[model samples]
Target: SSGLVPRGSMESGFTSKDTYLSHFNPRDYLEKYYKFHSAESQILKHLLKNLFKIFCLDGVKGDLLIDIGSGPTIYQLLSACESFKEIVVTDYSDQNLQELEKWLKAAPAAFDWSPVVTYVCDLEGNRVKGPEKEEKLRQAVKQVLKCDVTQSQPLGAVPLPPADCVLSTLCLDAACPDLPTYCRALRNLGSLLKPGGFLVIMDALKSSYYMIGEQKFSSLPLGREAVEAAVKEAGYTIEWFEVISQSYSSTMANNEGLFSLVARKL
Candidate 1:
């Protein structure tokens, strides 16, 4: 809470593009940061397994799912394929989108989420492209609109129709500059969902720092209590939520921690 920085302020120091590009690269950053061979990745797998169970994988058919701040890996989009009919993956960086496209081309079968659309939308301002860029859009089940998340305006830039569910993983802390800003952003994201819509959030709570490739980032620590309060204040009644504690010791290093929450909108 105390160590957090606010977005668009000196604390954040750089734009989303700068921060994201400095750290994340599909082949280099994700591989090392997630460490597929390490115990950390195993812990993540276990956590995701429990999340899928507690969240209940039903009623997602024909729903439009939006993945906010979708990085190069498109991990959440791939997972959502099993449930949702359409997946819109959005990010602030065009470079990140390009990387994602490259990955998708290499392993078309790996991402079974066909009819997928990718968009490069900035979250800070309401600047989005018009129909001129439509040809560049992916072979999505629907159109991909470019929109900003940090703006006060409505979600006019979103290409497809309104979404039934919105998801963000390890994204909120990076997007907001502080706790209040983060909460406000959550409210904004919630506004995009219809009443009784679903919201799925997964992040490393209390995690202050992470290394992606050679670059390192300081993440705002969003505790469980704060997240619960913010979600409720944003007009969403939580249907299911959980906190997972995990510990792993390996030849490389010893890591122990807890990550929290997977909720549905009410």
Candidate 2:
């Protein structure tokens, strides 16, 4: 608990704000750093397309979905809309959400994905403190309540109304204080699902550290074995989990990492 802050510390400056913002600044790392232009965006589209193909095998069509730590780019929400009926995206940064809205407004029809609703939920604290917050979030996709994995809350606090599936991308490493905390976050996320819901997560592993503007942070080098163990401990049996791709790039200061995983809660 001392090594790094749990994923729930909403206002904490260490891992939550400073560390995350330093390396993941959309302007610096994503837009300016990688220069994710039209071609790069197309490549990402292809990658997501393939991921959707695989997820469809598990009957991902028309199911309600939730995206935790959605960031400024709501690409996952756009992609999920192609297959799922409803999607709710959550993030701690209001600024990031605003940017996401801007992008949606500017993007072409191909990228036009209107989710049933959007809510600002702090993953580091109670998401259902007020009626206005809870009611608005609960309308679609169940109860899009707030959650901070580091702290304990009522079993049914999340606004995820017994979902059939849950999805997160690039969230664990950034939000979790450490590897064990990552596992706990997964367990908590899985709690929102029904008896046999699906869970899909994609992120980098064993990568070098960098900045997302002025904030500096590092991923915990969560390899396949570690992720598998975490999933198991979270009470979910992995149906299929593997590193889909691994690349070495200098865009974010020369790093090598793996892009992976598709698992179900059993």
Candidate maximizing lDDT: 1
TM per prediction:
0.71, 0.68
Candidate 1 has its poorest 10 consecutive residues by lDDT at 115-124
Error of 1 at 46 (Å): 2.5
Task: Supply candidate 1's per-residue lDDT for 53.
Answer: 47
- List, residue by residue over 66-171, the lDDT tens digit for candidate 1: 7777666554543355456666776665666666666545454333222122121111122434221222233332423333457653345544566777877767
**Number of the top TM-score candidate:** 1
lDDT of 2 by residue, 131-180 (tens): 33323322333323333444443133544466666777766776665777
Which ten residues in a row are the worst by lDDT in model 2? 115-124
> Model 2, residue 184: displacement in angstroms?
0.5
Instruction: State each candidate's clash count.
Output: 6, 15
